[PDB]
Amino acid sequence: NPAMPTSSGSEGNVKLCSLEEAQRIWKQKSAEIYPIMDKSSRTRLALIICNEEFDSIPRRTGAEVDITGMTMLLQNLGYSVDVKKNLTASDMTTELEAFAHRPEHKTSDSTFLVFMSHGIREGICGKKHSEQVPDILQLNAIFNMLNTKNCPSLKDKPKVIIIQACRGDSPGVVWFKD
Amino acid sequence: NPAMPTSSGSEGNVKLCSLEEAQRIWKQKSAEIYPIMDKSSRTRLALIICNEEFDSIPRRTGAEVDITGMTMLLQNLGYSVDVKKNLTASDMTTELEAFAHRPEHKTSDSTFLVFMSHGIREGICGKKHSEQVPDILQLNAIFNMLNTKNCPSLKDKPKVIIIQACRGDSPGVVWFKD
Amino acid sequence: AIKKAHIEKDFIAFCSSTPDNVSWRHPTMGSVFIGRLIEHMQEYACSCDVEEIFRKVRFSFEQPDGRAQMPTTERVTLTRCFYLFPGH
Amino acid sequence: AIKKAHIEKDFIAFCSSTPDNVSWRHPTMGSVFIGRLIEHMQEYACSCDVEEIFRKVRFSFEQPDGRAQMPTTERVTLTRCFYLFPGH
Ligand SMILES: *C(=O)[C@H](CC(=O)O)NC(=O)[C@@H](CCCCNC(=O)c1ccc(Oc2cnc3ccccc3n2)cc1)c1cccs1
Ligand SMILES: *C(=O)[C@H](CC(=O)O)NC(=O)[C@@H](CCCCNC(=O)c1ccc(Oc2cnc3ccccc3n2)cc1)c1cccs1
Predict the structure, then answer these.
(1) In whole angstroms, what is the distance from residue D22 CA to residue B47 CA?
(2) 3-state DSSP call for residue A113?
(3) In Å, how far from its chain's centre is CA B12?
(4) Cα dihedral sign for B117, B123, B128, B133?
């Protein structure tokens, strides 16, 4: 290992776990850690769906920064990243179903799913969304499409879902006096 | 401390945390632990709502065992326990609103809420529940009634909600071949 | 002087099963999730935070027999580790 | 021979805000939840499991300024600790 850490490697800005630390974690916890596959043979997959350009709702300016950051991070962590942009709820479902059918999951130990869009209380907005005609993908549907029934390849494997979206109109705050 | 541990004390069957262990936890994690109030002055509260006898749905035989176990455990942990039985969703709401208004929360560091009933996908069943006329308390309502707006006394304090209930009709399983 | 606070913070919910799915109960022995929760709380409250204990409860259900259920942690806004410090 | 498996297990969701509430984004700097998630993943993936990292992300939002949000962990059925072991 180099004297000074460098971001020029495959892990970029992600701080490396040493062999001393990896064995310490293997010792501090017995059989309560998810198994990791060999780095030489594993085919880790990740999917990013990001909606920026919408038909009827405000443009999500700055989303490109999120896409860049999340893509580079998941790659740093060892995942091959699919990036899909400006999709309807129907398109999101079709893409998720296809992702769940990917052969690479069989030789993978985990997956990351990332959704970035506008959102309401009920779920995540598709590109064609409006108040008059809703275009919503529910979080419930995401779980269903990736469970043991609909995605047997990811049985016993960590499935991490990250969602950047509003969940309603409210500012999320209340006042109090000290 | 006694040579052999005894369940005759206030903590009963709950394994005690020693002063050596408490300082070790205080050291292993810096400022990322919830503060605990002095044992001499704190007024910890917990609430158990359990529905066993229903108008139109099957009797929850064995619920008394759950009530006994959970009441004794929360007491062991230092909580004063309220036990309320056979309530409609409306009754559950009124009881939860009253619990959130209890003066003791101001001199408490945490709370436990325990719900035990029949349930469906949408939420927890009240005593008068039937398919024709639903009597349901949603998990969403429970959170709302105990948040910073509706329960300012529990601001910054851990609120633990435990729910024993069905969440639908399904057995929760799928088959696979080895 | 008034200050802003998060409307919803420091919550943790623990449900007996996953959405859509049943939770089991014995007529003389009680509910399996409740019994298992008590046993794990009795054993691990001294050394583990509540999130860790709940995970251990989930782990105990990992291997499915004739009847199965998977307890689920929900809507978590705990910003810190909640240790019970039993005895203190 | 066929065996039974839990229909839903080993999931974790992480949302940018609590239900009912907005999530923030800057036109040139991106989304605060995303930026904060990356920074924490970069720093702590080596030493902490994903649940712990998400909690740390929540903690970083604890003190509310002019604009506030509280990321929420949802529908957790992770039975074990998920360590990324970056570099391995
Ligand atoms: C809702 O669906 C979307 C979610 C999305 O990801 O698009 N949200 C909105 O539409 C937002 C748009 C916000 C645009 C206005 N931006 C800003 O004025 C602004 C200013 C500063 C800033 O930086 C920081 C710095 N530090 C922070 C700490 C904690 C939290 C936030 C912080 N932000 C960010 C953004 C909404 C439109 C109206 C209300 S929300
Ligand atoms: C749904 O709303 C309710 C939830 C509630 O808390 O009441 N559930 C039901 O109504 C159940 C009732 C189940 C009654 C039948 N009991 C049994 O046959 C039975 C047998 C053995 C047993 O013990 C064990 C032992 N080890 C276990 C390990 C893991 C999981 C479960 C284990 N159980 C318990 C119960 C339903 C009625 C129909 C379907 S579910």
Answers:
(1) 31
(2) strand
(3) 19
(4) negative
What are the structural domains, with CATH classification, of chain D? Answer: 1-88 (3.30.70.1470)
**D64 contacts C5? CB cut-off 8 A:** yes
Locus of tokens 């394994």: B15
CB A73 within 8 A of CB A10: no
Q: What is the DSSP string of D6-74?
A: ESS-SEEEEESS-TTB---EETTTEEHHHHHHHHHHHHHTTTS-HHHHHHHHHHHT-S--SS----EEE
Distances (CA, A) of D77 to B128, D59, D74: 32, 22, 9
Tokens found for residue B152: 């300012």
Residue B3 to residues A79, A165, B77, B152, Cα–Cα distance (Å): 54, 56, 22, 44
C58 touches chain A (CB under 8 A): no
Please say whether the beta carbons of B76 and B7 come within 8 A: no
The encoded tokens of residue A51 equal 């909606």
Q: Is B83 helix (H, G, I), strand (E, B) or coil?
A: strand
Portion 108-137 of B in contact with A at CB < 8 A: none
Candidates D16, D17, D20, D25: which one to mutate for ligand 1, based on the most atoms within 8 Å of Cβ?
A: D25
Record the resolution, in angstroms: 1.9
Secondary structure letter of residue B16 according to DSSP: P
Is the Cβ–Cβ distance between A174 and C1 less than 8 Å? no
Q: Could you tell me which CATH class the domain A1-178 is placed in? A: alpha beta
Cβ atoms of A93 and A142 closer than 8 Å: no
b/e D5-14 (16+ beta carbons within 10 angstroms → b) = bbbbbbbbbb
